[PDB]
C-alpha cells in the first residue's frame, strides 16, 4: 500500500549519512561541523536559490505558460530599451539565452547581506552535496562535461592563470592585493592567440564524443538488424572511421545499455566482435614478471622464396575470408541457440583451441564399442564398473608419430590410432577429438581465414583420374585390398555351407 | 578481355608489362569467383613470354588480394542473403510463421512453473524507459531483415553500401538518420592536435570509454610526476608546439575562442561582438577596412569587396 | 584469519583487448617498430619452456 515517489533533480532522493565526501576540504573537516549541517532542500542553499531564481526560471520560460509569454515580452522590451541597434529582431530563446549568459557572467562571491548572492563556502557546499547526490551515470556525465569543456581550457591555461581564477573565486581584496605585488603573476599571464587553440581542442573532443554518442546508435541499429548485410568492415568503409573503433563503439553501446538497466551484460559480444583478438591478445598474466609477444606462431620458410609457395598462398587467400563473424558459413553448424550460447559463452577459449583450421564442426562424434563375452558370467560382471574413467591409448611402430597426426586421427583411415575409454558404469566408448589430440604434442595456433568450400575448382584446380591411374592400382597384381574386404565381410555362411550351390530363401511346406 | 585478345590475336601486338599488370589487378580487385584463377593465368602468360616479374608486383598482388577480400566476402554473403530472402518469401506464404508465433510451450510451461510444477525464481522486469528495453522493442516490433531490399546490388554486393539505400533502410526501420550524406561525417582522421596528444602522454579524455566508471584514464591525486600538474604542463607544451606551428605558417590560424575573447582587451571584445567575426583575420579586415561594414557595425561578406587591379598587369 | 593474510601476491589482471607488450610492442600491420626478443633469451634451456 506504498507508492514510491518519483525522484528527480527538483526534489532529490534522501541519501545515507555514511557517504564519503567528494571534495577535498570536506574530507579533513572535523565531524562536529558535519553534525552541525542541517538537511535542507537544494534551493535553500543561497547558490541554489540564485540558480533557481535567475537561471532555472528563464529556462522554465520556454514552455507555454502565460507568465512565460509576459516575461518574454517584458524581456524583449527591456533589452530593446538597452540599445536598439544590436538586437533588433531575435527569437525568445535567443533573448533568454542572452539574459542567462549575462546573469551567469555577473556572478560574484561575497557576503549575502552585502549585495552579493552567496559566499564561496556556500558554493563549495553546493558542489559537495551536488556531487554526493549523483549516481554513477551522473558521475559519468560529470566527467564527460569535464572532458568536453573544462579539459581543453586546463590543457591550454598556465598555472598562474588558474591561480588568478582562484583569486577571482575567493574575491578577497587581501589576496588580490597580495597577488598583484608579484611581477611573475602579472607578466606570465596567457595571451589570447595562444588561448584560441582551446576552441580547436574542444571541437576535436566534441567530435570524438559525436562519433561515440551520435554515430553510435545508428551503427548499432544497422549492425543489430542485419549483420550479414552491414558487417563492421562495411560500416568502417562507408563511414571511414576505423575497424576497431566501430567494433569498440558496438561493444561500448551494448555494455552501456546493459549496465544502465541493471542487467548482467552479454559477455560473448567481445568474443564475437574481437574473436581473432581474443585468441591472440587475451592471456592469463601473473604478478611479478613481464611477458612478451610472439611475432609468428611457427618457424617457417617464407612464401616469397618460391613461386609455387606464392601461388599456394594466393590461392589460399582467395579461398579465405578477411573477417569472419557469427553469421558466416564456418559458424553455420550452430543451429540451436543453446549451441550458440555454449560456443561463445565461457568455453570459447576451449572450443577454438580444439582444431587450428576452422572446420564445419568443433570435434568428432562419439561412438561406443561392444564388450567381449566374459565366460564366468555374472561372477565377473561387476569388475569393469569402477569409480573413474579409464582411458587407454595405442602405441607401437605404426602409432605415435606426430608428423602423421591428422592422418592417425582420421576416421576414414583403416589404420587409425585406437583409443578406448571405459566409463565408471562399464561402457566402452571411443575418445573425443580433444581427447585424441591430447596424446600428441601441443598445437597452439588457429586459422581464422581459410574456409575450404570456397576453394577454386574450375580453372586450374582440376584433379584428374589419369593422375591417380598413373600409380596403376590393380587387384590381380596385389591381393591386399581384396583380403581386407574379405576380413571386413561377415563369415556367417561358413556354418550353413552344406545347408553351383547358391543361397536361397527358406522354402515353406506349411503354406505350399 | 575482348580488346586484349583482339590486340593479341588480330593485330599481333605483344602486350607490355603494364597492361599485363592491369589485367592481373582487375581480376584480383573483382570479388567474383575465379578472379585469382585468371590472375594466375595472366601471371603464367607473363612468365612464359619473357615479361619481367618484379617483386613489387608480387607484394602488390598480396596487398590487392588482401584488400579485395572485402569485396569477395560481400559477394559471398549476398548469396546467403538471397537464399534467406527466398526462404522467407516461401515460409511467409506457406504459413509456418503463423504456427510458430503462438508460444504454446510458454503457455503450458509458464515462466514461474518448471516442468514438474515447483515455483521458480523469475528476474524482475526492467524499466521500459531504459535504453535496453527500447532496443529489444525495436528488435521485436520493427520489420524483418528480409523485407528491407527486394533486389541486390548491381555488382554482386548487398544493397546498403551507399547512403541512399542506408537512409531508405533506416526509414523502413522507422529511424530518421542524423547523417544523410558524407559531409555530415565527423571524420576523426582530420584531427591533428588530438592524435599528437594521444601518442605521447595518453588519452586526454579518459572517460570517453568508461563502462561502469573504472576504464577512465586520469592522473593520480597524490601529485608528483604522475599528478595533474605535470600532465597539464606536458599537454600545454604540446599545444605550444602546435601554436608555434601556427605562428610559422604551417597550420591555419584558429578561430576566436570564448577563453581567448574573455581575456582580451574589452574594446576588442566589443569589436568582436559588434562585428560577428569568427577568425581574428576577419577582425583585422573589420579594422583595416572601415568602409566595408554595415551601419550597425556588422561585417559584410567577402563577395562585396573589390580591390583595385593595376594596369601594370597588362604588360 | 588465515585467509585474511594470503592476498593476491601471485596473479595479475589479464591483458585487455588490443593491448601492447611490456617491451612496448604491438600487433600492427607495420612491425618495423616492433622487435623480436629471441636473441636476448639464453641459448639453451634445460627442459622445455611452455612456449
Amino acid at each position: 500500500s506504498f507508492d514510491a515517489p518519483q525522484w528527480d533533480l527538483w526534489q532529490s532522493r534522501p541519501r545515507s549519512e555514511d557517504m564519503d565526501e567528494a571534495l577535498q576540504p570536506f574530507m579533513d573537516m572535523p565531524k562536529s561541523l558535519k553534525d552541525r549541517r542541517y538537511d535542507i532542500p537544494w534551493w535553500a542553499n543561497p547558490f541554489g536559490a540564485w540558480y533557481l531564481q535567475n537561471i532555472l526560471s528563464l529556462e522554465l520560460l520556454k514552455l507555454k505558460s502565460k507568465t512565460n509569454a509576459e516575461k518574454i515580452a517584458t524581456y524583449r522590451s527591456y533589452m530593446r530599451s538597452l540599445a536598439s541597434g544590436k538586437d533588433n529582431t531575435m527569437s525568445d530563446d535567443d533573448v533568454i539565452r542572452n539574459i542567462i549568459k549575462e546573469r551567469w557572467k555577473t556572478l560574484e562571491f561575497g557576503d549575502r547581506n552585502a549585495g552579493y548572492p552567496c559566499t564561496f563556502g556556500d558554493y563549495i557546499q553546493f558542489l559537495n552535496e551536488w556531487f554526493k547526490s549523483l549516481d554513477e551515470e551522473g558521475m559519468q556525465r560529470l566527467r564527460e562535461h569535464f572532458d568536453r569543456r573544462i579539459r581543453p581550457l586546463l590543457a591550454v591555461m598556465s598555472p598562474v592563470d588558474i591561480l588568478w581564477l582562484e583569486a577571482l573565486t575567493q574575491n578577497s581584496p587581501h589576496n588580490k592585493e597580495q597577488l598583484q605585488r608579484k611581477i611573475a603573476f602579472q607578466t606570465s599571464l596567457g595571451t589570447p592567440e595562444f588561448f584560441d587553440m582551446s576552441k580547436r581542442l574542444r571541437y576535436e573532443i566534441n567530435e570524438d564524443y559525436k562519433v561515440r554518442d551520435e554515430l553510435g546508435p545508428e551503427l548499432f541499429a544497422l549492425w543489430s538488424k542485419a549483420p550479414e548485410r552491414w558487417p563492421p568492415e562495411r560500416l568502417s568503409k562507408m563511414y571511414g572511421l576505423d575497424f576497431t573503433l566501430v567494433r569498440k563503439i558496438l561493444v561500448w553501446h551494448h555494455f552501456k545499455a546493459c549496465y544502465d538497466a541493471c542487467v548482467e551484460p552479454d559477455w560473448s559480444l567481445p568474443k564475437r566482435l574481437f574473436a581473432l583478438e581474443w585468441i591472440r591478445d587475451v592471456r592469463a598474466r601473473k604478478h611479478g614478471l613481464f611477458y612478451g609477444k610472439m611475432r609468428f606462431a611457427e618457424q617457417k620458410i617464407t612464401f616469397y622464396s618460391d613461386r609455387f609457395l606464392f601461388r599456394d598462398l594466393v590461392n589460399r587467400r582467395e579461398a579465405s575470408y578477411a573477417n569472419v563473424w557469427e553469421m558466416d558459413d564456418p559458424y553455420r553448424f550452430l543451429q540451436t541457440e543453446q549451441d550458440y550460447e555454449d560456443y561463445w559463452g565461457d568455453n570459447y577459449d576451449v572450443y577454438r583451441r580444439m582444431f587450428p583450421e576452422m572446420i564445419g564442426r568443433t570435434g568428432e562424434p562419439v561412438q561406443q564399442y561392444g564388450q567381449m563375452p566374459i565366460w564366468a558370467g555374472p561372477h565377473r560382471q561387476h569388475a569393469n564398473k569402477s569409480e573413474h574413467n579409464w582411458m587407454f591409448a595405442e602405441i607401437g611402430v605404426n602409432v605415435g608419430h606426430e608428423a602423421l597426426k591428422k592422418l592417425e586421427l582420421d576416421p576414414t583411415n583403416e589404420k587409425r590410432r585406437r583409443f578406448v575409454i571405459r566409463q565408471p558404469d562399464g561402457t566402452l566408448r571411443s575418445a573425443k577429438m580433444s581427447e585424441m589430440r591430447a596424446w600428441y604434442w601441443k598445437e597452439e595456433w588457429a586459422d581464422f581465414r581459410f574456409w575450404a568450400p570456397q576453394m577454386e575448382w574450375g580453372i586450374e584446380n582440376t584433379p584428374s583420374q589419369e593422375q591417380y591411374q598413373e600409380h596403376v592400382p590393380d587387384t590381380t597384381d596385389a591381393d591386399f585390398r581384396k583380403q581386407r574386404r574379405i576380413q571386413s565381410r561377415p563369415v556367417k555362411w561358413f556354418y550353413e555351407s552344406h545347408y553351383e550351390r547358391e543361397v536361397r530363401w527358406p522354402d515353406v511346406i506349411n503354406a505350399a | 578481355e575482348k580488346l586484349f585478345q583482339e590486340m593479341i590475336l588480330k593485330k599481333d601486338l605483344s602486350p607490355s608489362r603494364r597492361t599485363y599488370h592491369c589485367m592481373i589487378f582487375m581480376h584480383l580487385s573483382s570479388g567474383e569467383e575465379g578472379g585469382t584463377a585468371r590472375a594466375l593465368r595472366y601471371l603464367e602468360a607473363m612468365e612464359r613470354a619473357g615479361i619481367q616479374v618484379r617483386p613489387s608486383l608480387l607484394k602488390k598482388i598480396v596487398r590487392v588480394n588482401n584488400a579485395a577480400g572485402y569485396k569477395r566476402d560481400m559477394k559471398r554473403r549476398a548469396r546467403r542473403i538471397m537464399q534467406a530472402r527466398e526462404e522467407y518469401l516461401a515460409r511467409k506464404e506457406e504459413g509456418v510463421s503463423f504456427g510458430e508465433g503462438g508460444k504454446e510451450g510458454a503457455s503450458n510451461q509458464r515462466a514461474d512453473v518448471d516442468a514438474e510444477g515447483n515455483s521458480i525464481l523469475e528476474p524482475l522486469a526492467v524499466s521500459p524507459t531504459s535504453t535496453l528495453a527500447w532496443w529489444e522493442k525495436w528488435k521485436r516490433e520493427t520489420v524483418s531483415k528480409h523485407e528491407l531490399f527486394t533486389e541486390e546490388g548491381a555488382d554482386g554486393t548487398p544493397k546498403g553500401e551507399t547512403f541512399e539505400e542506408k537512409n531508405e533502410a533506416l526509414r523502413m526501420m522507422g529511424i530518421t538518420s542524423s547523417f544523410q550524406t558524407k559531409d555530415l561525417v565527423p571524420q576523426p582522421d582530420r584531427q591533428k592536435l588530438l592524435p599528437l596528444i594521444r601518442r605521447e602522454e595518453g588519452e586526454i579524455a579518459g572517460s570517453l570509454w568508461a563502462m561502469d566508471g573504472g576504464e577512465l584514464s586520469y592522473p593520480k591525486d597524490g601529485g608528483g610526476p604522475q599528478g595533474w600538474g605535470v600532465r597539464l604542463w606536458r599537454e600545454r607544451q604540446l599545444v605550444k608546439r602546435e601554436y608555434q606551428k601556427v605562428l610559422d605558417g604551417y597550420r591555419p590560424v584558429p578561430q576566436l575562442s570564448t577563453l581567448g575573447n574573455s581575456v582580451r582587451t574589452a574594446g576588442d571584445q566589443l569589436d568582436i561582438e559588434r562585428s560577428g567575426a569568427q577568425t581574428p583575420g576577419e577582425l583585422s579586415d573589420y579594422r583595416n577596412f572601415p568602409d566595408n561594414r554595415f551601419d550597425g557595425g556588422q561585417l559584410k561578406p567577402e563577395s562585396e569587396a573589390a580591390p583595385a587591379v593595376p594596369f601594370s598587369a597588362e604588360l | 584469519k588465515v585467509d585474511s593474510f594470503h592476498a593476491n601476491t601471485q596473479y595479475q589482471h589479464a591483458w585487455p583487448l588490443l593491448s601492447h607488450d611490456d617491451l612496448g610492442n604491438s600487433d600492427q600491420s607495420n612491425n618495423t617498430k616492433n622487435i623480436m626478443y629471441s636473441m636476448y633469451m639464453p641459448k639453451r634451456n634445460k627442459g622445455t619452456a611452455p612456449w
Binding site: 571534495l23 577535498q24 569543456r149 582562484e166 | 592522473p219 593520480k220 591525486d221 570564448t258 581575456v263 | -
Partner: peptide, 30 residues
C-alpha cells in the same frame, strides 16, 4: 594492497569560476 583512486581532483577543478571565462559553460552547448 593498492587502492584504486576515485579521482577527487576532478571535483577541485569545478571550484573555479569557469562562468567568468567560458561565458556560461555549465549550461547546454550552443
Amino acid at each position: 594492497l593498492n587502492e584504486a583512486e576515485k579521482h577527487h581532483d576532478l571535483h577541485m577543478f569545478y571550484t573555479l569560476a569557469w562562468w567568468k571565462l567560458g561565458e556560461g559553460i555549465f549550461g547546454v552547448d550552443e
